[PDB]
Design a protein around this ligand. Structure first.
Ligand SMILES: CCc1ccc2c(c1)[C@@H](NC[C@@H](O)[C@@H]1Cc3cccc(c3)CCCCn3cc(ccc3=O)C(=O)N1)CC1(CCC1)O2
Length: 355
């Protein structure tokens, strides 16, 4: 999959994007890779922040669906006009597919002033597509229309320019060390997973595990931070504060690598009563602006770039599971390294999920 290695770019905190083409003749656009949503949407009008935009008038293969659409994310939102067109990924598989495309015609706090992307590729499932689950997401269209296998993987590498790889249809073994460990996708909407235990410096947070997944835990390449439910964030911060008593930092805030604690999330494994743990280092959760990149949520745990930059993450849709392995590009020192380890014995893991 050599041609797909290093096909991701971005600036820190502004997301990771891949080059795509849309229309005939092909119009090149940079498109955010977002496992936390399910719509393919591109700027279609001359917003002043945009380097370029989709011009439907130039495409002979454009088809109008004569239907509006609107997607609000955590912070921004857009509305637009649904249609279909031919799409490919220059540094992806050698194929062209007819996909649904939302042409964005109005937006608020969505495009970023100074960013180098013009659209978003929602890689999650139909259940959360707008306006409804009948709007087939891109990856579903790709798998339907080609022989591309039903999985993709992400190696997000970080550094204020960032880089990475999206391997569509497979796994590049040179991008990770050790073994992949798989956690089940609990339900196909977001990439929802179940966290069964949390350790700060190998010390259990000792919370009811249901709190870790209240109301969701998801894997989201579109989110920068590791986001934790407040009751879990509260307990997480408390322990991180204690762990790091050598120095004091102000309340609002919430290089000496060895002073900061590693954080371990234990994830439901593939077998009854079996889990595994992923562990990140301070170099993952201390990101240059350093800013502390763990935050509160009312919408559950979001394993964003802070988690994903430690690991090669395989979205094995075919088998309804997500794989984690230590990333071959992750930043580490002579002392410590990000880790994926197992098996562990964990009882009542099905009770950790919220209903
Ligand atoms: C289906 C639409 C939708 C609606 C709500 C929503 C989500 C998705 C979940 N995923 C959010 C993710 O899709 C978006 C994508 C995005 C949108 C605009 C810009 C960018 C990314 C790039 C910049 C990344 C910075 N950043 C983006 C988001 C959140 C935090 C954050 O730091 C964001 O909304 N990401 C994340 C959650 C579900 C749990 C919280 O909320």
């Amino acid at each position: 999959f050599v041609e797909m290695v290093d096909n991701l770019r971005g600036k820190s905190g502004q997301g990771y994007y891949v080059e795509m083409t849309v229309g005939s003749p092909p119009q090149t656009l940079n498109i955010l890779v977002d496992t936390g949503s399910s719509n393919f949407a591109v700027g279609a009008a001359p917003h002043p922040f945009l380097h370029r935009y989709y011009q439907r008038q130039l495409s002979s293969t454009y088809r109008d669906l004569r239907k509006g659409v609107y997607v609000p994310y955590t912070q921004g939102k857009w509305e637009g006009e649904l249609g279909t067109d031919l799409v490919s990924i220059p540094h992806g598989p050698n194929v062209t597919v007819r996909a649904n495309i939302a042409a964005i015609t109005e937006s608020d706090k969505f495009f970023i002033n100074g960013s180098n992307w013009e659209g978003i590729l929602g890689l999650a499932y139909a259940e959360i597509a707008r306006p409804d689950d009948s709007l087939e997401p891109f990856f579903d269209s790709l798998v339907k229309q080609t022989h591309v296998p039903n999985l993709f993987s992400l190696q997000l590498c970080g550094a204020a320019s960032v880089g990475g790889s999206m391997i569509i249809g497979g796994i590049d073994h040179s991008l990770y060390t050790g073994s992949l460990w798989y956690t089940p996708i609990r339900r196909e909407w977001y990439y929802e997973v179940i966290i069964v235990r949390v350790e700060i410096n190998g010390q259990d947070l000792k919370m009811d595990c249901k709190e870790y997944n209240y109301d969701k835990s998801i894997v989201d390449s579109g989110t920068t931070n590791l986001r934790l439910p407040k009751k879990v964030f509260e307990a997480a911060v408390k322990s991180i504060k204690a762990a790091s008593s050598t120095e004091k930092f102000p309340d609002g805030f919430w290089t000496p690598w060895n002073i900061f604690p590693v954080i371990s999330l234990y994830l439901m494994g593939e077998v009854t009563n079996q889990s595994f743990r992923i562990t990140i280092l301070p170099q993952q959760y201390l990101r240059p602006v350093y800013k502390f990149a763990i935050s509160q949520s009312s919408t559950g745990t979001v394993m964003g770039a802070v988690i994903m930059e430690g690991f090669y993450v395989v979205f094995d849709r075919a088998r309804k599971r997500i794989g984690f392995a230590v990333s071959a590009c992750h930043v580490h020192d002579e002392f410590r390294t990000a880790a994926v380890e197992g098996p562990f014995v964990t009882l009542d893991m099905e009770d950790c999920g919220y209903n």
